[PDB]
Design a protein around this ligand. Structure first.
Ligand SMILES: NC(=O)C1=CN([C@@H]2O[C@H](COP(=O)(O)OP(=O)(O)OC[C@H]3O[C@@H](n4cnc5c(N)ncnc54)[C@H](OP(=O)(O)O)[C@@H]3O)[C@@H](O)[C@H]2O)C=CC1
Ligand SMILES: NC(=O)C1=CN([C@@H]2O[C@H](COP(=O)(O)OP(=O)(O)OC[C@H]3O[C@@H](n4cnc5c(N)ncnc54)[C@H](OP(=O)(O)O)[C@@H]3O)[C@@H](O)[C@H]2O)C=CC1
Ligand SMILES: NC(=O)C1=CN([C@@H]2O[C@H](COP(=O)(O)OP(=O)(O)OC[C@H]3O[C@@H](n4cnc5c(N)ncnc54)[C@H](OP(=O)(O)O)[C@@H]3O)[C@@H](O)[C@H]2O)C=CC1
Ligand SMILES: NC(=O)C1=CN([C@@H]2O[C@H](COP(=O)(O)OP(=O)(O)OC[C@H]3O[C@@H](n4cnc5c(N)ncnc54)[C@H](OP(=O)(O)O)[C@@H]3O)[C@@H](O)[C@H]2O)C=CC1
Ligand SMILES: O=C1C=Cc2c1cccc2[N+](=O)[O-]
Ligand SMILES: O=C1C=Cc2c1cccc2[N+](=O)[O-]
Ligand SMILES: O=C1C=Cc2c1cccc2[N+](=O)[O-]
Ligand SMILES: O=C1C=Cc2c1cccc2[N+](=O)[O-]
Lengths: 271, 271, 273, 273
C-alpha cells in the first residue's frame, strides 16, 4: 500500500498516447475538450448528432495540431446509437482511455408551464443520455480509465427562477458520480462531474439573459460585463478552455485519487 | 416587515382545519403521513394506484380518529391521472392546503446491467411523477400552501453500491426543491424535501439486505440490529412516525421560513 | 420487535414542551430573547442567561412569568469556561434539571482578510466557536437522558458572495461540523444535536451591520435596507424575524425532532448569499 | 471581446510550474514534505517551513536541490503571528517573490466532548484554524498578482461517523468556509483560494491515530490497519499517500487551476466516513 501510483514529477500530468471520446464535440465546450485533449497528446473521437461539417472541422484541426482524430455520429437520446458509437469507436483506434460525457440541451420555464414533452426532451438527453453513455463507457474503458460527466452550477444554484427542469437534470448527475464511482472502481476507473458556471458558447448566447434579472434588453456587450462583474470576483467571463483544462487534469494520473467528486469551475460564482 | 407571521405560542404548530393530499397513502410512510396529519386536525385525501382495499382502510381509520378522509385513484406515471386526481380532490373538500408527494419505487443493480426499461420505470415515478404532482399542486394550492417532496439519504450517500438509478432519481428532488421554492413563492407556498434514512415498511422488508455488506443470509431480527447499531448513534430503527412528525412541522406555520431546504431524517446515519 | 415500539405519543402531543426546562445563552436580547419567550409560551421553565444586559434579562424573566411559566436569569460570559460550568450548576439548582439547551450567544465582525488583527480574530472565535463548544460540553454533562442541544450557526457558513467576512463566517461554519461530531458522542445519553442557520433576522446585530452585506449600501435608509433584504434575500419577499427561528427551535426541542440529529437546518426564506 | 482573450497558454504548458516560487508550511515531514518535493520536481523554487523538525527540514531542502531546483528552510511556529510575518519577510528576501502558498501545518486530536479541556481545544485551534488564517493573511500581502493559496482541510470537516473528534473536525471545517470567503477578498489581486480535503494518508499523523477511526481497532496490527483503510475507505481498494495530495496541489497551483476558486476538493479515493 506504499507503492507509488504512477510517475513522480511533471510526467504525471501527461495525456500522451491516450485515446479519448467526447460527446457533442463538434461545438462549444465539447469542441474545446477535444482540441485541448489533442494538444496534450490524445487521439480524439469526436461524436456529434447534427453538426456534421463542424465535426469534420474539429477532426481536421486536431490532426493539424499533431494528433489523430475521427468523428462518429450518434444521438444520445437513443440507447442503440450509443451502443454502436462505442463499438465503432474501439475499432477506430483500438481502445478507449478517457470518456467525456458532454452533450446537453438547455431549457427555461415556470414550473406551472412545463409540459411532459419538454420535460422528457431535456431528461432523455441531459440525464438518461449521460447515464447510458456512462454504461457503455464502463464496458469499453481500459482498466484505470476515466469518465467525466457534465453537470452545472444549476444543480446547487439558489437564485435562478424558472429553471427546475434543466437544473434537476444536472443535479441528478452529481448523485450519479458518487454512485457510479463505487461500481466502476472494480475496473479502477474514476468518475467525476465538472460543474461549470456560465461559459461563452452557443448555449450561452441563446439563454444568457434568462439568468439576468431584467436583462431582456441587454446588449451582448452588457451581458458579458454583468457575467464578469456579477458571477466572479476575478472579474471576467468563463470560457471553454477554463473547463477543458480541468477535464485534462482529471483525465491524467494527477487525478488518480479524485473520484466520486463534483468539481465546480465557475470563478467563485454565487448563483 | 416587522409584522408577526401567524400566532405566537403553541397554536403555530396546529394543523386544525387544513386539507391535505398524500400520494401513495395506502401503505408505508404515506399511510403514516395521512394518519398523523389526520390526528392533528387535517381532512385527508388518500391517493393510491393499486392498493384499493388498504386505501379504504386508511380512510376509515382516519374518520375513526376524528377527521374526514377520502381516497382517489391515480398513477403518477401518467400525467393525465395526476391532472384529474387534483380536480377530483378539490371537489371533495373544496380546497387544498398541503400536498405530500410520497409515491415511489426502489431499484438495485450494477450500472453495467441497467436496462432502459428499468431506468425509465424508476424515473417516471420517482422523478417525473413527483415533478408533475408538484406542477398540479402549485395550480391548486391555497396561497400560503405547502408542498413536501420525498427524497432519500441515497441522494447524498457514498457507500451504497449498485444504486445509481434509484439514488439519482432521488438526488434530482433536492434540486427541484431549491428551484421550485423560487417559482412557487409567488403563491407564498413553501417547498421542501424530506430525506429519510431506512424506515421499516414493505420497501424496507424487500431490499434492506441490499444495503448491508454480506447481508443476504441475515434474519429479519439481525437486519434490524444492524440497522439500529450501524445506521444510528441513537441505536434504534427508523419508523414511519419519525417522518410523519417532521412532515407535520413543515406543513404548519412553524415551518414558514423553511423553504428550498432538504431535511435529513435518519437518526444521524452515515451511508 | 422492540424496534417496533413507537417513540413518544401519536398525534399533536408530540409537539408539546409542557413542563420542560430550558436554558438559553444570551437570552436578554434578540433571537435568544425570542427563543426563551416562545419556549416559555409552549410551557417550558426558562433560565435566561446574559453577560451584560442585566436589566433586559430581568425583563425577559418577568415577561415569561406573566405568560404563565417560571423563569430566572443567570449571569455568565461564554469567554470564561469557569463561568459556564457554574452557570449550569446554578441552573440545575433553580429548576432541578435541564431538558433543552439553546446555545445562542454570538458577536459579528467585518474586515478584509489583510486587515484582520489577532486580537479581533480571537475576540470572535472565543465567543462564537470556543464558547459554544464549552456550553455544549456542560450541556451534555447536565442534560436529562433524551434531552436536546441546538447550536447557533448562520447562512454565512456556506455563503458565497459576502466579502470581508472570513472570521465570522468561519466561526459559524465550524459549528455545522460540531453538530455532526457532537451528535455521535451525545447520543450515548439519547440527546440530539442540531444547528439552526438563520439568514438575516431583524435584531440589534442586524441594525449594526446589515449594510455590510449590501453592495454600495452605505447610504441606504433603514426603510431601503429592509426592502433590499425582503426582495433580494427571499422569493417570499419579506424580512426574517426572531419568531421565524424560535418556532424551528421549539420543533427540534420537541419529540417531533426525535429522528433529526446531526443536521443543519437553514431558516432564511430561501435566500441565496 | 476583451473577455474573449484566452487566459494563459493553450496545450500542456498550462500545467507548468517552471520558474515559480512556492512556500509550504510544515514541509519537513509528511504531506507538507511531499508537496515541496513534487512542486520542486515541476520546477518551483521552494521555501521549506518547519517549527521543530530542523534536521528533517534541512534534508528536504538538500533533496530538492539534488532534483534540480533551489530551496531553503525557514523556522516558524504558526501559533505566533509574529513568526509568520517574519517568515514571509525572510521568504521574499531569499527568492525575490512568492507565487504559490501551501498552508499545510496541523495537529490531530481525539476525545469525547465531555472530556475536552480548554487547553486542548486551544492547542488545536491555534495551529489548525488561527494559524492557517494568519498564514493566509500574509500570503495575500506578499503574493504575486495572479498567485495561488491552497489551504489544508480534511474529510472530517464533513464526516458523519467518526466519534470523539469534534475539536479537530471543527478546526478543519472552518477552513472550507475560509476558502469561500477568502476567495472573494484575495481576488482583487487575482489570487485563487481553494481547500484540499484528504481522506486518510500514510504519514506520522496517520500512524499515531489511525486506529481511532476504526471501531474496535485498538488491537489491529499495522498490516491490518492498512487493509481496513484500503478496503473500507475506498472502492479503489488502496491506502492514500502524500503524492496523491501533492499532485492535486500542483494542478491548483498551475494555470490549469485558473477558474477553480472558492472550492473544496476532496481527495480520499471515494471514501465514506
Ligand atoms: N455553456 C454554459 O453556460 C454551460 C454548459 N453546460 C453543459 O455543458 C455541455 C455543453 O454546453 P455548450 O457547449 O454550451 O452547448 P451547445 O448548445 O453549444 O451544444 C453542446 C453540444 O451538445 C450536443 N448535443 C445536443 N444534443 C445531442 C444529442 N441528442 N446527442 C448527442 N449530442 C448532442 C451538440 O451537438 P449537435 O450540434 O450535433 O447537436 C453540441 O455538440 C452541456 O451538457 C451543457 O448543459 C454546463 C454549464 C454551463
Ligand atoms: N422505506 C424506506 O426505507 C425509504 C423510503 N423512501 C421513499 O418514501 C416513499 C414511500 O416509501 P415506502 O412507504 O417504504 O414504500 P412502499 O414500497 O411501501 O410503497 C410506497 C407507496 O408508493 C406508492 N406507489 C407506487 N407506485 C405508484 C404509482 N405509480 N402511482 C402512485 N403511487 C404509487 C404505493 O402505492 P400502491 O400500493 O398503490 O402501489 C405506496 O403507497 C417512497 O418515495 C420511497 O422511495 C425514502 C427513503 C427511505
Ligand atoms: N441577526 C442575524 O441576522 C443573525 C444572527 N445569528 C446568530 O444568532 C445569535 C444572536 O444574534 P442576535 O440576536 O442578532 O444578536 P445581538 O447582537 O442582538 O445579541 C446577541 C446576544 O449575544 C450575547 N452575548 C454576547 N457576548 C456574550 C458573552 N461573552 N457571553 C454570553 N453571552 C453573550 C448578548 O448578550 P449581552 O447583552 O449580555 O451581551 C446577546 O444576548 C448570534 O450567535 C448570531 O451570530 C445568525 C444568523 C443571523
Ligand atoms: N495524515 C492524514 O491522514 C491527514 C492529514 N491532514 C492534514 O494535513 C496536514 C499534515 O498532515 P501530516 O503530514 O499527516 O502531519 P504530521 O503530523 O506528519 O506533520 C504535520 C506537520 O505539521 C507541522 N507543524 C506542527 N506544528 C506546527 C507549528 N506550530 N508551526 C508550524 N508547523 C507546524 C509539523 O512540523 P514540525 O516537525 O516542525 O513540528 C509537520 O511538518 C495537517 O494539517 C493535517 O491535519 C488532513 C487529512 C488527512
Ligand atoms: O448551465 C448553464 C447553461 C447556461 C448558463 C448556465 C449557468 C450560468 C449561466 C449560463 N448562461 O448561459 O448564461
Ligand atoms: O431510500 C431507501 C429505501 C430503502 C432504504 C433506503 C435507505 C436506507 C435503507 C433502506 N432500506 O430499505 O433498508
Ligand atoms: O449572520 C448574520 C449576522 C447578521 C446578518 C447575517 C446574515 C445575513 C444578514 C445579516 N444582516 O445583519 O443583515
Ligand atoms: O484527518 C485525518 C488525520 C488522520 C486521519 C484523518 C482522516 C482519516 C483517517 C486518518 N487516519 O489517521 O487514519
Amino acid at each position: 500500500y506504499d507503492a507509488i501510483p504512477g510517475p513522480l514529477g511533471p510526467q504525471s500530468a501527461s495525456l500522451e498516447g491516450k485515446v479519448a471520446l467526447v460527446t457533442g464535440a463538434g461545438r462549444g465546450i465539447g469542441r474545446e475538450m477535444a482540441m485541448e485533449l489533442g494538444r496534450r497528446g490524445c487521439k480524439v473521437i469526436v461524436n456529434y448528432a447534427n453538426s456534421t461539417e463542424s465535426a469534420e472541422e474539429v477532426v481536421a484541426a486536431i490532426k493539424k495540431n499533431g494528433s489523430d482524430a475521427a468523428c462518429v455520429k450518434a444521438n444520445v437520446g437513443v440507447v442503440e446509437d450509443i451502443v454502436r458509437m462505442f463499438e465503432e469507436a474501439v475499432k477506430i483506434f483500438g481502445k478507449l482511455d478517457i470518456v467525456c460525457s458532454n452533450s446537453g440541451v438547455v431549457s427555461f420555464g415556470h414550473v406551472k408551464d412545463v409540459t411532459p414533452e419538454e420535460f422528457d426532451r431535456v431528461f432523455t438527453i441531459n440525464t438518461r443520455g449521460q447515464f447510458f453513455v456512462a454504461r457503455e463507457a464502463y464496458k469499453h474503458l481500459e482498466i484505470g480509465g476515466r469518465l467525466i460527466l457534465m453537470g452545472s452550477i444549476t444543480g446547487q444554484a439558489k437564485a435562478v427562477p424558472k429553471h427546475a427542469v434543466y437544473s434537476g437534470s444536472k443535479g441528478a448527475i452529481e448523485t450519479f458520480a458518487r454512485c457510479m464511482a463505487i461500481d466502476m472502481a472494480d475496473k479502477k476507473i474514476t468518475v467525476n462531474v465538472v460543474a461549470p458556471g456560465g461559459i461563452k458558447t452557443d448555449m450561452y448566447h441563446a439563454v444568457c439573459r434568462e439568468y439576468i434579472p431584467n436583462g431582456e434588453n441587454l446588449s451582448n456587450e452588457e451581458v458579458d460585463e454583468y457575467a464578469a462583474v456579477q458571477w466572479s470576483p476575478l472579474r471576467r467571463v468563463g470560457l471553454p478552455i477554463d473547463i477543458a483544462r480541468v477535464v485534462c487534469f482529471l483525465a491524467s494520473n494527477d487525478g488518480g485519487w479524485v473520484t466520486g467528486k463534483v468539481i465546480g469551475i465557475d470563478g467563485g460564482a454565487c448563483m
